[PDB]
Subunit: 344 residues, 3 copies
C-alpha cells in the first residue's frame, strides 16, 4: 500500500508511567527497501506531565531535540561542569552522543512534548540510552561492574557504594519532581501568504545543522488551504503531523503510483526527494519537517505563479510536451494568481 506512511501506532512504547512516556518509531527500513537511505535515523517521542524530570542518562547517538509543545529546562553534563538551557516551543538543539543530560518540565499546568531525531553511527539504526539510576525497569549500569572493581574505583566499602548509588530507589525514569537552542521561527517564513506559512532552516545557515546535513521546517496552514504540487531536489523529508489533519497526495515511480493518505496528530509521512507532493489542511494545521541529505536542496513547484518550473519551458517546447498549444499551456499556468499555498 504505502511504504511511506507511519501512523502513531508504528511507535513502540519504551517506557511509560503516570508522569509521561518515551516511544520509538519503528525503523524506517523495517518493512521496506525503499527507505534504505533512512536506515541510520530513528524518531523518538517524549511526553511528560507538569513538574517532572527525565532522569540523567546519555545516548549512544547524536540527538536533535525539538520542543513540539510546552517548555523545558535541559541540562547537559560535561566532565568539567554543566550547561542549562530553557527551551520554548519551536526551539531545537543538538545533543552530541555521550553527553549525560536530564530534562525537566517546569510548568505546573502544561504538558511537555518533545520530538527526538536520532542520528546513529555506533550500531546503524540502533539507539541505546544508559541510565545512571537503578529502577524497576533496569538497574544502574554501574551495578554491572564487579564488587572489587567498584570498591577500588570509589575507594569505599561495597555496602557504602550499594546503599548510596546502586540500590533501587525510583520506580521509573520519569519522576515527579518536588551550541545553544534555536527556534524554528527565528526567521521570516520563506513562504507566506493568506493561506499559510513555511519556516525553514537549512544547514547552510545553521552550524548545528551543517554537521548533520539536515534541514528543519515548520508548516502552518489555515483549514482548507492547499500546499500545491512541488518536489524537493535532494532532501527526503520526514513530515510529522503536529496539530490538525492533512490530506496528502504523494506521487511516486516505483509504475506511476498515487499514495493518498489523511494524517492525524502524531502520524508521519516520509517524502522522498524528486517525488511530487501536495497536501491539504483539513483543519488548521501545523507540521514539522526534518529533511535529511539537505545540503543544497531546492523546492520546485509545478503550479502557482512563483517558482513554477513549468512556466519556464519555451513555448515551442511546451507545445511538443503537452496536448495544448504553447499559448494555451501558458494561459492555463497564468490562471492561479497565488503562490505556494492556495485556497483548496
Amino acid at each position: 500500500n504505502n511504504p511511506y506512511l507511519f501512523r502513531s501506532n508504528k511507535f513502540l512504547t519504551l517506557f511509560k508511567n503516570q508522569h509521561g512516556s518515551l516511544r520509538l518509531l519503528q525503523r524506517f527500513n523495517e518493512d521496506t527497501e525503499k527507505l534504505e537511505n533512512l536506515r541510520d535515523y530513528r524518531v523518538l517521542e517524549y511526553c511528560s506531565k507538569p513538574n517532572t524530570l527525565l532522569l540523567p542518562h546519555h545516548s549512544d547517538s547524536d540527538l536533535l531535540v525539538l520542543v513540539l509543545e510546552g517548555q523545558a529546562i535541559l541540562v547537559l553534563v560535561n566532565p568539567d561542569g554543566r550547561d542549562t538551557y530553557k527551551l520554548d516551543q519551536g526551539d531545537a538543539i543538538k545533543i552530541q552522543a555521550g553527553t549525560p543530560f536530564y530534562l525537566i518540565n517546569p510548568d505546573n499546568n502544561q504538558n511537555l512534548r518533545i520530538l527526538k531525531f536520532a542520528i546513529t553511527f555506533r550500531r546503524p539504526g540502533t539507539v541505546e540510552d544508559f541510565f545512571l539510576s537503578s529502577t524497576k525497569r533496569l538497574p544502574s549500569y554501574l551495578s554491572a561492574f564487579s564488587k572489587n572493581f567498584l570498591e577500588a574505583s570509589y575507594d569505599s566499602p561495597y555496602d557504602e557504594i550499594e546503599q548510596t548509588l546502586l540500590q533501587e530507589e525510583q520506580e521509573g525514569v520519569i519522576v515527579k519532581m518536588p551550541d545553544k537552542p534555536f527556534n524554528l521561527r527565528s526567521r521570516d517564513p520563506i513562504y507566506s501568504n493568506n493561506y499559510g506559512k513555511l519556516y525553514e532552516i537549512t544547514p547552510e545557515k545553521n552550524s548545528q545543522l551543517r554537521d548533520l546535513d539536515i534541514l528543519l521546517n515548520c508548516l502552518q496552514m489555515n483549514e482548507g488551504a492547499l500546499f500545491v504540487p512541488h518536489y524537493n531536489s535532494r532532501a527526503t523529508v520526514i513530515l510529522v503531523a503536529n496539530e490538525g489533519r492533512a490530506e496528502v497526495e504523494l506521487v511516486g515511480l516505483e509504475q506511476l503510483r498515487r499514495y493518498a493518505a489523511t494524517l492525524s496528530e502524531g502520524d508521519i509521512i516520509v517524502i522522498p526527494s524528486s517525488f511530487p507532493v501536495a497536501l491539504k489542511a483539513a483543519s488548521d494545521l501545523n507540521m514539522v519537517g526534518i529533511g535529511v541529505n539537505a545540503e543544497n536542496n531546492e523546492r520546485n513547484f509545478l503550479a502557482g505563479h512563483k517558482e513554477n518550473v513549468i512556466r519556464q519551458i519555451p513555448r515551442q517546447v511546451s507545445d511538443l510536451t503537452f496536448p495544448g498549444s504553447g499559448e494555451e499551456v501558458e494561459e492555463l499556468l497564468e490562471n492561479q494568481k497565488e503562490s505556494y499555498f492556495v485556497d483548496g
Copy 2:
C-alpha cells in the same frame, strides 16, 4: 568467468522508437559481490536520430552527461529561468538531481550519442525519471493528482486542465522536432607519443568533478599499439569502448587470475584499483573512462621507461626479489625505450 565485463547486451532498453533510444546498464553488483563499491552508480546510454528532442523530465539522481558522438542543445530549467548549452563531442556536464531538462539533436544528418553516468542517493542503485508528458509509455505524473487537487492548484476547471496538460499527445518521449560544459580534450594529454594519447581530468582540477570524486579520461590508440601494464592506486575505472576494438588483460587476486577479453563498440570493462591491467588496440581505438574514488589517484607502471616503479627498486633488493641479478633486472627494464604506449 569475468565479473568485470559488461557487454552491450547487459544493457536493458528503457525506451526506443524510430527516433532514438535510452538504455540502462544492469546494476554493477547485480551478479557479483566484487563490485560492491559501485552499487550507487548506473550507466545509461542515450541515442537519437537527427532533429529530435528528448521530452522534458527530471531525474532523482545527479547525472554526469558525456557526448560520445554528435552535438546537442541542452536546456536546464530552473524555477527562475533556464540555461541553454551547446554540447559538442567530448563535452561533459553535471546535471544536478531534480533539474528538469530536455535534450535536442540539432544536426540534420548526424546521430547524437550520449553516455549518462548516474550517481544515486535517494534509493541506492536506482534511477527514476519523471516525465512531464503523458505518452503511450506512461501518463504525465501530474495526472496522478486527484481532480480536486488539480483544479484548486491551477484555478481552472478539470476539463481545461485535462485537455491542456494531461491528455496523451506524443507516442513516446523522443519526438521528431520540426556550471558549464568542459571538454575531455580541453587540456594537453597526460600521456602522448607516436602510439597513443591519454587525456585526463581529475577532481583536483575541475569543480564539477570535485563534488563527485570522479575522474574522466579519453584514450585514443593507433591500431597495434599497447598501453603497458600498470594499475591505479585508488580509482576504479569504468572503461567504455567507444570506437574500435581492444584486447584487454586484467590481472586480479580473488588466487592469481587473468581475465582476458576483447571489447567491441559499446562493451564495458571495470578496472578495480590496484589490479594490474594492459590493453591492445586491435584497431584504431577510442575509449572513455570514468573513475570513481578518484581523489589523489596515481597510475603506477610496471613496464616502459617513465614512471616505471619497478625501476625504482635498489639493486640489492631487486636481486632478492627476482631470479635475475640486480644488474640483469636493470638492463631488461632498460630495453623498452618508449613510455606508456608502445608498439604491440
Copy 3:
C-alpha cells in the same frame, strides 16, 4: 557470550616460514551484527626474525603501520623514486594504498613485530597484497600477462623475461637478507600518575590521522593498577594487548550485560563508544588502542576526582537519581583522591 573479544586464535595465518609470519584477524562483523561499523577494517600482524626482508608488494588498502616491537627500515617506492624510513618501537606511519614497499628488520638479535591496521575501500572488508615476486606460494602477478603482451611491453624475448623476472626464486615472501613516522609517545601522556599513563594522538592533532578519522593511544599500567570506569563518546576502540595481562569489564546494553574477560598478549577487545569500561592490570601492562570514528571524541569518567561527570550533577538532582542523599552521593564521590588510574 562476548561478541567483542578476539583472542589471538581468531587470527588466520596468511604466510609463515622460519623467518617470520603474517596473520590476518577475522572480519569484525564475521560472527556478529554488532560490529557493523567496523566492517571496512582489518587487523594484520607481521612478525619477522632478525635480518629479514618482506619482499616488495603493494596493498589494495591504506595501511596504518605500528611498530609494536623491534625496529625496521621501511622503503616506499614511487614512480619517480623512493623514501626510506627508519622506524622505532612506537612509531606509526600511514602507507597509502597502491604504494609498493618492502620491510627490513635490520637488527641482528631482536625480532620485529608490526601491527597493520587496514582501511579498505575497493572491496569492503577485503585486503589483497600483490607481490612482485614468484614464490612457491604464488607466482609473480606479472606472469599472468600473456607472452605477447610481456614481450611487447619490455621489448625483449620471452625467454629473457621469464629467466630474469618470472621464474621462481625465493621460497616465500620473507627472506633472510644477507608523510613521515610519528611516535605514540611523541607527546606528554594525557593521563599520568603513580599507577599508569595514557598517551593519545587524535586526528585533530596529526595530519596522517585526520584523513582516516582515527586516534591512537598507548596505555601503560603498573601491575595491580585500575583504569576506572569511563566511556568514549564517539570512538570505538580496538584494544590490543601488547605486553602483560588485563582483566577487563565492559558494560553494554544489547539488556544490561557485563562482558568480563582476561586478555593475554595478542588478545584483542573492541570497546564500542558509549559502553562503560574498566580494566585491571594483572601484570605490568602495555596496550595499544586504535579508535575509529575518532574526531571530537571525549572520554567521560564515572569515578575518581578529575573529569568525573557524576560529580557535576546538582545535588537536588543527584538526590532524585540515586538512593542516597545529595550530600551522601557527593561525599562518596569525594572518597577517591586519585584520577584515571588507581590502586586496584
